[PDB]
RNA sequence: GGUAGUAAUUUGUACAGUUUGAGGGUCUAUGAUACCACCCGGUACAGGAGAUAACUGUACAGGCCACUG
């Protein structure tokens, strides 16, 4: 079993040269001879990188090349190579991209006045619920507090209730209050989903879900300290909306997953613009104990973790600042080509790229790690491989258009 | 009628050929060292 | 609540194989005819491996009071 897959000694020099020419042809077709006989399948003499498919003979390699999948994969590789040689954008191109991102932000972006209107909606909710549930209170969470979602995004409100009360009963009597109140109509059991009568914006009510509020506040802080982050996240969200990847019901990714990916890109740039919650600075930190770590609360220009604090924004000598459009093109390059979304976790907490084997994750499609929910896969809505390929194709086409 | 792409068999087609692989040789002079471009007469 | 299994049925992807279709050939001067005897090359390249739909089986992602507590 330790012998070579193809023995040069047994073959003549003329035969050896002929086989070398055949292997050069196979290399041009992305077929590579096995260096050693596989223990499980020693019969195979070659492998196809495009499909990672074992091939018994050279004729089998040609048969595989004839197959449509090989043609599709070689076309994909050719597109990748073509994208690789695209020049970085010129200063005028970067300025144009930044202007486009700003225009997208203005057209579809949450502003301070939208937040005040949403606070007024929550005030109406508190007014109507006060009569029946004085103890209960309402807060903004999700897209509302973050300011990184669109202005048309549905209002999201979270209820704080006493410990004695239970989430199902609380949601039920909240549903009852929504039933009787005139302000809220087209109410449905579903969270409790309703349509605001006066404002006219879709409204959603939730109980518990403390992790969602934590991630929303973390992203709100990241946006506040990092000015370029908000335009980038808004532009990426607009791209997702145009491509329909934002819609969950169609198999697309959730909205804030795009913001998480944007902050991950900003953190993983050659010059890191944002820090990692967990790093080698922490004493006793390790990937094996990564699950033990968790994020507790968000402070002003500070973070809390438990197994100590970390700064929300990196403090470095002469930290670099670059245009928003440059960061957007860099993100397109980072995700379309630079980052293999298949088997590398988008882990904000740790600088190192967490392997799927560590989290026993599918390794199939786009994967994002929640800042506060380590065991939760926020990309589970994307469960179809064709949709995964659709996202990759969309990202590559966007890179090509913008490059 | 024409020499096959692999193993150099006229009557045998490339797909039909089941013989063991053989070196590709220049038809003009039947020389392994010289290809079609490097034919001595050329 | 978690793991897997799961008849009858619902999507998606190919096609190892079958079969139907138009197309593809190019390349004639190089004739050997007739139901008297039918087939060789010079015009004519490169290192280049040759289909899409109807059809059969097989693993793989979702749907299914499927399915479980
Ligand atoms: Zn042949």
Residue numbers in the entry:
A (entry chain A): 199 to 388, 395 to 511, 535 to 630
B (entry chain B): 136 to 177
Task: Please share text taken word for word from the publication where this structure appeared.
Tumor-suppressor let-7 pre-microRNAs (miRNAs) are regulated by terminal uridylyltransferases TUT7 and TUT4 that either promote let-7 maturation by adding a single uridine nucleotide to the pre-miRNA 3′ end or mark them for degradation by the addition of multiple uridines. Oligo-uridylation is increased in cells by enhanced TUT7/4 expression and especially by the RNA-binding pluripotency factor LIN28A. TUT4 and TUT7 are multidomain enzymes whose specific targeting of RNAs makes use of three zinc fingers, combined with two copies of a nucleotidyltransferase domain (NTD), one inactive in the N-terminal half of the polypeptide (pseudo-NTD) and one active in the C-terminal half. Our structures reveal that pre-miRNAs engage the enzymes in fundamentally different ways depending on the presence of LIN28A, which clamps them onto the TUTs to enable processive 3′ oligo-uridylation.
In conformation I, most of the pre-let-7g could be resolved. In this conformation, the RNA stem interacts with the TUT7 LIM, while the let-7g 49AGGAG53 region coordinates with the zinc finger of TUT7 and ZK domain of LIN28A, forming a stable ternary complex. Furthermore, despite clear density representing the pre-element (the apical loop and short stem region preceding later removed by Dicer action), no density was observed for the CSD of LIN28A, presumably due to the relative flexibility between the LIM + LIN28A and pre-let-7g. Based on the position of the RNA, this complex is believed to represent the initial step in oligo-uridylation, a ‘capture’ state in which the pre-let-7 has begun association with TUT7 but not yet completed its engagement. By contrast, comparison of TUT7 ternary conformations I and II finds no change in the relative positions of the palm and fingers subdomains of the LIM while the zinc finger binding the pre-let-7 stem moves substantially about a 16.8° rotation of the linking helix. The binding mode and overall conformation of the pre-let-7g miRNA appears to be remarkably consistent in all three LIN28A-containing complexes, apparently due to the LIM/LIN28A clasp and other key interfaces shown by mutational data to be the specific interactions responsible for ensuring efficient and processive oligo-uridylation.
